[PDB]
């Protein structure tokens, strides 16, 4: 669990950074970067939630067909 949590937390920083940084002349980030950081998070999380839901559904189904 904790491992899953930290792993997704590390993956998500990576993806969101790699996704929403297109200015590399400066030292500091503009608020748009914060807007991304806040949107990427919730979106990725809803995504992972739906995926886990469908996976658990399939799992109990396959466990119900023995």
What one-character DSSP code corresponds to residue 21? -
Judged by CB under 8 A, does residue 63 bind another protein?
yes
Judged by CB under 8 A, does residue 3 bind another protein?
yes
Contacts of 41 (CB under 8 A, 6+ apart): 12, 16
Of 24, 41, 20, 42, which is closest to residue 32 (Cα–Cα)? 20
Judged by CB under 8 A, does residue 1 bind another protein?
yes
Binding positions for another protein, 42-61, rule CB under 8 A: 42-59, 61
Chain residues binding another protein by CB under 8 A are 1-29, 33-34, 36-59, 61, 63-66
């Amino acid at each position: 669990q904790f491992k899953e949590f930290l792993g997704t937390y590390n993956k998500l920083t990576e993806t969101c950074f790699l996704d929403c940084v297109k200015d590399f002349t400066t030292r500091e980030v503009k608020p748009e970067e914060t807007t991304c950081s806040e949107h990427c998070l919730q979106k990725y999380l809803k995504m992972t939630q739906r995926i886990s839901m469908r996976f658990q559904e399939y799992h109990i189904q396959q466990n119900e067909a023995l």
